[PDB]
Design a protein around this ligand. Structure first.
Ligand SMILES: COc1ccccc1NC(=O)C[C@H](C)Cc1cc(C)cc(C)c1
Ligand SMILES: CC[C@@H](C(N)=O)N1CCCC1=O
Length: 479
């Protein structure tokens, strides 16, 4: 009873404080700084999806082992997503983002000097574990600096760095190791997978470097009884915004803010308490206050991730199959298609950013899901390479909007003391759905074109049937 009242007072006051701070230089700087972190995740996703299996096929491996790396690394991503989402609530957004990025960068760096297959697999799996927490923590961290008046518009532009990271990974793959053989012989003569591995780590390293300049979120401090730190961070935000706008004379007027109140021996108690608190936060997502919302968000996330990841990983393979069939009558194609998809997303990002705060998140999600279901089905009508590429561009442009709406809903549907936990759980479910979709769809490449498309269409139809039942978060203070 009492705690809900106090947290409602804090939520009401936080939006007023943010309106006093306003939007400007600080938010955009933080936007770029976290865009680097999302770029790291996009790079890892591309590497796992496309580089590793191609390498395995180009590797001295038994037929039974031609697809293990992607599966195991995605499972590691799932585990890391849940782990880092759970901890971010208790340790902080910036702290957990730094730790996860550090793990990712370190184990990426190690993977360059491995010599076997098990060791490279191990290093890359731990790297996947590290990066898995980037998306939940980034989306929870940035949204806490945004006022309700334009939170949806500003959150819709984060996904571009994911696309740019994927394009970067594809371009580096083409430039350094274009459909070369893979061995663990090359002597790291630039044109070796080791250098590509090292190059792909740069976005994460730069994200770590830049991230150490930004301030921890004030909402986390206020939710945990740290008044003075939150006040200083909010004053920093206000001063930066006003000094950049040409009004340095202004004074931050907020007086007081509502707040909510041997080594092997100490570490044991600390770890047990952290685990208990994280598990308690997780179970709260299934209580009577949130059980329905969580159960429907699970379905929406699962279906959307299934369809999207399955189609994206299946499309290059079926293009290669079409080319092979025509010939019977490589690495550049993936990069070109990635660049085209990144261009196609941009109109969708513009439209979603414009309409998110006007038509609401629910209508964006539902309409975009219906359009994605229809456009994905149109893939069955394409016959030539160009037609397939154009239809996929249409699918991506109409689908990216639903992802922005889903991200905004996931941010706004859960309270600030459990936001990262719920987002991490749903992102782990998304990674599991990606595993299942990539495993199922790719098996049909040499058999039939219709089955993957129909499965994706049915999954998107089911997902769009659930999106209509979620509540609308438009025009409400950040929980
Ligand atoms: C932007 O590229 C990435 C960014 C981050 C992770 C992976 C990838 N790329 C892929 O998965 C390959 C795939 C073919 C790209 C693509 C997707 C969509 C919806 C539409 C088009 C036209 C292309
Ligand atoms: C940050 C981008 C990310 C997301 N919305 O969580 N995306 C884009 C489509 C596939 C995916 O996971």
């Amino acid at each position: 009873a009492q705690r809900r009242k106090e947290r409602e007072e804090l939520a009401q006051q936080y939006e007023a404080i943010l309106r006093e701070c306003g939007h400007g230089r600080f938010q955009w700087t933080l936007y770029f700084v976290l865009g680097l972190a999302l770029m790291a995740d996009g790079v890892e996703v591309f590497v796992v999806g496309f580089v590793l299996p191609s390498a395995e096929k180009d590797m001295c491996l038994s037929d039974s082992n031609k697809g293990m790396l992607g599966l195991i690394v995605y499972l590691g991503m799932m585990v890391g997503a849940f782990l880092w989402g759970g901890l971010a609530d208790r340790l902080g957004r910036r702290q957990c983002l730094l730790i996860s990025l550090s793990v990712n960068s370190v184990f990426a760096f190690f993977s360059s000097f491995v010599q076997g297959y098990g060791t490279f697999l191990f290093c890359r799996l731990l790297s996947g574990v590290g990066i898995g927490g980037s998306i939940p923590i980034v989306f929870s961290y940035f949204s806490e600096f945004l006022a309700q008046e334009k939170r949806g518009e500003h959150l819709s532009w984060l996904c571009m760095f994911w696309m740019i990271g994927g394009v970067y990974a594809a371009a580096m793959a083409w430039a350094i190791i274009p459909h070369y053989g893979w061995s663990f012989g090359s002597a790291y003569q630039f044109h070796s997978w080791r250098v590509f591995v090292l190059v792909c780590a740069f976005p994460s390293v730069f994200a770590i470097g830049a991230l150490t300049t930004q301030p921890e979120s004030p909402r986390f401090f206020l939710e945990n009884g740290k008044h003075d730190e939150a006040w200083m961070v909010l004053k920093q935000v206000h001063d930066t915004n006003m000094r950049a706008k040409g009004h340095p004379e202004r004074v931050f007027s907020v007086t007081h803010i509502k707040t909510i109140h041997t080594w092997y021996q100490r570490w044991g108690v600390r770890a047990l308490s952290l685990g208990g608190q994280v598990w308690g936060n997780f179970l709260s997502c299934f209580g009577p206050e949130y059980r329905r919302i969580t159960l429907m968000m699970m379905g929406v996330w699962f279906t959307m991730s299934f369809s999207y990841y399955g189609l994206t990983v299946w499309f290059p393979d079926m293009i290669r199959h079409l080319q092979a069939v025509d010939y019977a009558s490589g690495a550049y194609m993936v990069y070109f298609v990635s660049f085209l998809g990144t261009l196609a997303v941009l109109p969708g990002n513009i439209v979603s950013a414009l309409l998110m705060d006007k038509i609401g998140r629910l209508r964006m999600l539902a309409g975009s899901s219906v359009m994605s279901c229809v456009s994905c089905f149109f893939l069955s009508f394409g016959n030539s390479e160009s037609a397939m590429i154009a239809l996929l561009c249409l699918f991506g442009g109409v689908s990216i909007a639903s992802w922005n709406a889903l991200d905004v809903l996931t941010v706004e549907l859960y309270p600030s003391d459990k936001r990262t936990t719920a987002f991490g759980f749903l992102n782990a479910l998304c990674k599991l759905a990606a595993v299942l979709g990539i495993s199922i769809f790719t098996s049909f490449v040499g058999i039939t074109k219709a089955a993957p498309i129909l499965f994706a269409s049915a999954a998107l139809a089911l997902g769009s049937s659930l999106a209509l039942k979620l509540p609308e978060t438009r025009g409400q203070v950040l929980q």
